[PDB]
Amino acid sequence: MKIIALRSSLKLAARIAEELKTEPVMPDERRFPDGELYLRYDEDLTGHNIFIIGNTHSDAEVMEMILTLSAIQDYRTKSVNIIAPYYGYARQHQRYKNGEPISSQILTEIYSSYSNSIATVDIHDEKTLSYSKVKFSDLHANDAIVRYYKNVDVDYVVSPDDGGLARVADISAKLGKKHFFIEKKRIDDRTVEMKVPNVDVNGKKLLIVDDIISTGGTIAKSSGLLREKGASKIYVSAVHGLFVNGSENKILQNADEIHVTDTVESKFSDISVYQEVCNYIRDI
Amino acid sequence: MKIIALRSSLKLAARIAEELKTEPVMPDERRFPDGELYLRYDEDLTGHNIFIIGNTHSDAEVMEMILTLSAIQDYRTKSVNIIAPYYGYARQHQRYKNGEPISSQILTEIYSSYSNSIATVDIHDEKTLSYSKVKFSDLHANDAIVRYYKNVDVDYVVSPDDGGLARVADISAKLGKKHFFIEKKRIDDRTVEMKVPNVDVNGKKLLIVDDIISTGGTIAKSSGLLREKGASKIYVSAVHGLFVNGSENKILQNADEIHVTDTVESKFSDISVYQEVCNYIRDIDA
Amino acid sequence: MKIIALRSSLKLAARIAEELKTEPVMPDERRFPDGELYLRYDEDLTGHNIFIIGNTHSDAEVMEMILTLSAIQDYRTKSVNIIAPYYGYARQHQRYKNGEPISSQILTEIYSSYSNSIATVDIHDEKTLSYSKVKFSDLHANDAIVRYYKNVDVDYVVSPDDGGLARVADISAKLGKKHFFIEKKRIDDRTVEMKVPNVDVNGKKLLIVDDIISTGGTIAKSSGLLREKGASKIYVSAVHGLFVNGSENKILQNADEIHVTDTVESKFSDISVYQEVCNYIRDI
Amino acid sequence: MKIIALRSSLKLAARIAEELKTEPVMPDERRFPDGELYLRYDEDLTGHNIFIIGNTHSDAEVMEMILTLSAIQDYRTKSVNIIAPYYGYARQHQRYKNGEPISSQILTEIYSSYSNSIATVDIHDEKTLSYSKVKFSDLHANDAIVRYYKNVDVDYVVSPDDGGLARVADISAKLGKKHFFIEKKRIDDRTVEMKVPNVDVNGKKLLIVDDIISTGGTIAKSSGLLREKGASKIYVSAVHGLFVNGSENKILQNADEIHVTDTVESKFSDISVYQEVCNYIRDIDA
Ligand SMILES: Nc1ncnc2c1ncn2[C@@H]1O[C@H](COP(=O)(O)OP(=O)(O)O)[C@@H](O)[C@H]1O
Ligand SMILES: Nc1ncnc2c1ncn2[C@@H]1O[C@H](COP(=O)(O)OP(=O)(O)O)[C@@H](O)[C@H]1O
Ligand SMILES: [Mg+2]
Ligand SMILES: [Mg+2]
Missing domain, CATH: 3.40.50.2020 (Rossmann fold)
Incomplete structure (x- = not known):
């Protein structure tokens, strides 16, 4: 298995990797001069079950998650499993009122499109779990x-x-x-x-x-x-x-x-x- | 037709709307206390061809685009058409080192999944057009x-x-x-x-x-x-x-x-x- | 057997020859006035297994290796075996980005074209070993x-x-x-x-x-x-x-x-x- | 056609390119900290007849030529043609003492293995032309x-x-x-x-x-x-x-x-x- 520790989750991810006796793989990460996000995972993740650990709340965290989900496609991995300790946009989630996005729906669809499973700790409302095509687990x-x-x-x-x-x-x-x-x-x-x-x-x-x-x-x-x-x-x-x-x-x-x-x-x-x-x- | 004018493109979208004799529909938009993005479109977009106009390069712009693409599913539209006058991440259109993202690929795939077409003006490299499931036009x-x-x-x-x-x-x-x-x-x-x-x-x-x-x-x-x-x-x-x-x-x-x-x-x-x-x-059309 | 000790490897080559109870054959070597490299091996290498020992990192080392591979063709040797203690251009080796040479590929092809075997100590990345037509060994x-x-x-x-x-x-x-x-x-x-x-x-x-x-x-x-x-x-x-x-x-x-x-x-x-x-x- | 102008031949290669109405393509070139040579050609050379122009006499020139010959294999070219206005080692075109290299022989063999043709201007002795597998022209x-x-x-x-x-x-x-x-x-x-x-x-x-x-x-x-x-x-x-x-x-x-x-x-x-x-x-041609 490979644990990927994203910026928002360095502490918990490190604790997790240590317990599992594995490396907390961190990206090389910086912003281009124009503000665009750059990530690189130079470790060979081929053939491994991958666990990406990072929150999905801030704009930057979402970009870090999405770009990571692309970066790891450079490797023929065994599985890709998202673990977002705190899951963003689970602030309901439905439309009240109309013309509002069901933000956790579209975001969950995106994440689910590029992973084999998702999990989070104590999601704010469990309806959001239903928006995933892959198994979306609520940990406690x-x-x-x-x-x-x-x-x-x-x-x-x-x-x-x-x-x-x-x-x-x-x-x-x-x-x-x-x-x-x-x-x-x-x-x-x-x-x-x-x-x-x-x-x-x-x-x-x-x-x-x-x-x-x-x-x-x-x-x-x-x-x-x-x-x-x-x-x-x-x-x-x-x-x-x-x-x-x-x-x-x-x-x-x-x-x-x-x-x-x-x-x-x-x-x-x-x-x-x-x-x-x-x-x-x-x-x- | 309905033109949606996102924050990053208000000037251009307004000029476009005025030329086409239509409203530049803006969202009500704000940040929750925790920093998450809130949008609302109260106009009835049912049965119209929708044109969403906004750039896709900053983190906030990407969130604005994605959340707008969710918001419009609240309406039965004829079509949904993205126009990103400046298309972000078009500089990262391949991997130059192992383990890099092809950022323009995943982002294009996302946009394409929630629209019927995409267009941009002078994309930095046309390879990215091929990442799109729907027609992705490069205007000049x-x-x-x-x-x-x-x-x-x-x-x-x-x-x-x-x-x-x-x-x-x-x-x-x-x-x-x-x-x-x-x-x-x-x-x-x-x-x-x-x-x-x-x-x-x-x-x-x-x-x-x-x-x-x-x-x-x-x-x-x-x-x-x-x-x-x-x-x-x-x-x-x-x-x-x-x-x-x-x-x-x-x-x-x-x-x-x-x-x-x-x-x-x-x-x-x-x-x-x-x-x-x-x-x-x-x-x-529209 | 004959050990050839090139300029970059005089110390290790000498240690090797002493252990093997043989001569560390050194070239006569100088630069022409125009800067071109001159080498000469006046010892009769006919009928011997030859071991050329020298690094392949600097421009001069590469020229010394290539010109040696020509000079020894003056003799009907039994075999020619390259040992480059430190192998140059193994700094990956692949293309990142495009229009870059795979330097260790072309260089390994050249060396392999004029030898019966190659070896090096702890190559920087083992992919380079695959660029050789002859057996290319990684010593440790x-x-x-x-x-x-x-x-x-x-x-x-x-x-x-x-x-x-x-x-x-x-x-x-x-x-x-x-x-x-x-x-x-x-x-x-x-x-x-x-x-x-x-x-x-x-x-x-x-x-x-x-x-x-x-x-x-x-x-x-x-x-x-x-x-x-x-x-x-x-x-x-x-x-x-x-x-x-x-x-x-x-x-x-x-x-x-x-x-x-x-x-x-x-x-x-x-x-x-x-x-x-x-x-x-x-x-x- | 594509003309590649190596460091040693910039003046001549530029004159040639201008006469033929084409770019004198130069590499981005530098030395790594450890002194190894880095080259990069970002221009798309696919499907063109390539003419690499550079001398072959200094250690650095030889490395520049060899590494260029590797770099161009990153493209599907029509042909690869070496022009070394001054051809190095042409003075060492035979053995004058036992155990000397025939330096022009091994170097010519190398260049010939990675090109479709070689040419030089006024080679010091034409014997060296016979060391080449491909046509090796002696211009005057x-x-x-x-x-x-x-x-x-x-x-x-x-x-x-x-x-x-x-x-x-x-x-x-x-x-x-x-x-x-x-x-x-x-x-x-x-x-x-x-x-x-x-x-x-x-x-x-x-x-x-x-x-x-x-x-x-x-x-x-x-x-x-x-x-x-x-x-x-x-x-x-x-x-x-x-x-x-x-x-x-x-x-x-x-x-x-x-x-x-x-x-x-x-x-x-x-x-x-x-x-x-x-x-x-x-x-x-080209
Ligand atoms: N927003 C950006 N700003 C600056 N550089 C970027 C940006 N996005 C990607 N890059 C980098 O630009 C480089 C590719 O550009 P370039 O060297 O012109 O090659 P290409 O011809 O494929 O465009 C890559 O190293 C890539 O990581
Ligand atoms: N770059 C060089 N500069 C000076 N002399 C060289 C160079 N390369 C080879 N030589 C030497 O020049 C000599 C051959 O020249 P020359 O006496 O004119 O005979 P030839 O008629 O065969 O050219 C050889 O001793 C050779 O080692
Ligand atoms: Mg670029
Ligand atoms: Mg002479």
Whole structure:
């Protein structure tokens, strides 16, 4: 097997390759004077199962993935397998309203056209998996998150909204903890919060888990609610830590700690999903 | 017909739309907080021949094109036709080292999969046309360049290298002028330039034509050479004026004027290719 | 047998002849006033197996080889066998890009046209061996390098890149040592290094081995990385020490010692490959 | 047709190309850090008759020729034709002692293996032509030398030794002049020179012709002899002006002017052989 480690995924890809006892093959990569992307893989990939590891979120990441999918055609490979730790454009994904692209559809079609399989960790909505002609697997960071928090004092695991429930239920079951979620809705300029079930959080230590942190708005609002009601400690975790300005500070206004995975590498990437990805690679 | 005018081609697409008496339909476009691209076309495009006009060279331009090609599937269209006035990655049309992408191949395959036709103006190498499943037409700015310079005093049309010759031959013939090219080559840290044929440029007014100006190195050097040998005027034109890293100023150190087309819009875009693109559009109908 | 010792290979050729108990036959050689090369072999080579030993890298070396291949036709020899310790133009060898010569192809064809066999020590890429009509053997300096380092304190043998792996694996196996390689790639103006496997080099003694040292750039960059990470001693070896200005000083910025073979004779030629070449001659 | 102009022959090859209305194609050429030679020809040479023009006497020239012969195999050519205006190693065309190379033999064999024809101008000894598998033509600078000296006041054409006689006979006949040669020989540390026939050169203007000037010894000596016997003017010409070790100055101690051809370019290259080479090229076609 050959692991290809793209720019966005150097850390996780390196962790993966080390575990698999193989080279994290990196491209030579630069921009031409006119801004066009150049890539080169001088290693002979002929006859190998190839695992390309890189995110598909930014314009540059998409170009790096597409150009890599062309570059490796220089070799008669055994298979080509895309693993995008964080999959871009899975922000639904459908049309609302009309004349909007189903971006994850066309992008998934493209990727699927040039690969034998695709996988990602905790896609934002599973409908997107259906857009692939090849098998598109949804891996989960649950076990890695459970491993991290097994040695932490937690009273409840909490979803910030009424959608990340299955993940919170599974993680809490694995930690042997109770769980609940917060429903937040805006009704005529005023905000209304419901806890479900209506757990008493006074003096309690809470682990809030979500799939993505972008602006941090959702998590920060929920942390503030819980701190207000007397939560004694709030840990914030997510799979994909995008942290667009200035999400970190909004969240730490009321949360004590932030721990996300290495799907998107940042200073808060304390939890690695390499084992989960290695399992997939081993079983593919 | 519906003309979609993407961000990179607003000037040219608007000129095209106005000539064809139709709307230059622009997307509502913005970036999500996380930096992903959002587009929306609220106009009803159902049952029309669609012409999407936008360049394909920057990362953002490629995303704009691809996401537009997804957006239009929300409508039952008659046809979908891509026109990329400047076609990106046409310089990477083969592998020059093992493990390189043939970038123009994969990108052309993608565009072709979601359209009924593709067209560009003066592609850097026509090999790339063969990467397309649908008809991929190579339009030419020649007549537009001729129309501009028929009112300029020109003695010779010149290619700055031994590659853009057919264009220089065609343009010069339509101006009623003679032409030559410059061959520049490095031989052991020394540069040698040959003029072919070895035209005496003393007191002569020269029009240098190339397909793309990016770093402007070859043209700036040739301009200096020709100025050195006594050229009285030097005009520099190219179809695609990218102008990276001071290129226009390096060229103007020795050339008198730069005039490029509006395939890539800049302050040097004095020659519009709108009529050439309009003719192509009329041919494909609508 | 007759050994012919050409200008570039006087030292190794002498070592070879002494071991074989035979004369290292040298040409009378000078330049005509107009710069043309003159050679003469006044010894009677009739009826002997001839072994011409000389490098094929510089313009002058190529002319010396070609003119020697003509000069010896004055004698009815038993066989003519070329041994080029360092083989020039094996810098790939193919066309990248187009309109480039496959230099090692035409040169190998020429040599093969005038000989019964060719051999070299550690050719830079084995594709070149296929360009010969006669048997073209690739000899290896591995055993001589192992002999040298058997009495040196070494923790790991290291390849400076992901291509000289088989040599490093064989040498380390013979020394009873672990090994690893460094993958270096440039990604957007910044440099990225991976160790494979990700060996801890803190306080460790490293032997870095490569086939050729030219500008010393590759080796010097890798030595610097390892010194930076706490390597306690770095030995640098290569088969062919070209050392173009000012490679030696770049390398010794962070390496402790340089030891190369006598394929290309320099002040750093501490390791002789005469036994390896004698084996080939004996078995031909 | 495609003309390739190698480093050593840029002046002559350019003159040839211009006469034939074609590009003098030069390689991009440089040395790798380790001193090995790099060449690249990016022009598409497919389907053309190729004429490679470069000398073959220095180590670098030989490498340039050989590597060019490899480079052109990257193209499907109609034919490959070597023209080495000055052909190196033609002085070593046999063994004069045991164990010497016949250098012109092996080199000719190499060139012939990778071309369809070879040509040179005034080879030092025509024996070498027989070493070539393909047709190896020996062109002559005679008419070019005549064209130059038809406008010079000349009484006799002279060979400086008893070897270059046919050339001196031909040139003198075309100038309408008489001729003689000098025989110089060493007999016991004393030099004896005979003029054949024993022409009185007092007050006479002499044109000395030889194929090659290298160290210039024979010509400098003969010039001094003729000056001593009262020659009023002495012109020295040769096809190949190598000029080693002060040769031109040693000659000019007693000769009035030196004029050689452009087979080897120097400041003395006043007589171009471009027309002779062009005629040959036209014959082989393209
Ligand atoms: N956007 C770009 N800007 C500059 N150079 C590029 C770009 N894309 C590709 N290239 C490079 O240009 C080279 C090919 O150009 P060129 O040497 O003219 O050969 P060709 O005749 O095949 O075009 C390749 O090395 C390729 O990697
Ligand atoms: N490039 C050269 N410069 C000077 N002398 C040379 C060169 N190449 C060969 N020779 C020598 O010139 C001699 C042959 O010349 P010459 O005596 O005129 O006999 P021939 O009549 O056969 O030419 C030989 O000794 C040969 O080694
Ligand atoms: Mg190019
Ligand atoms: Mg002689």
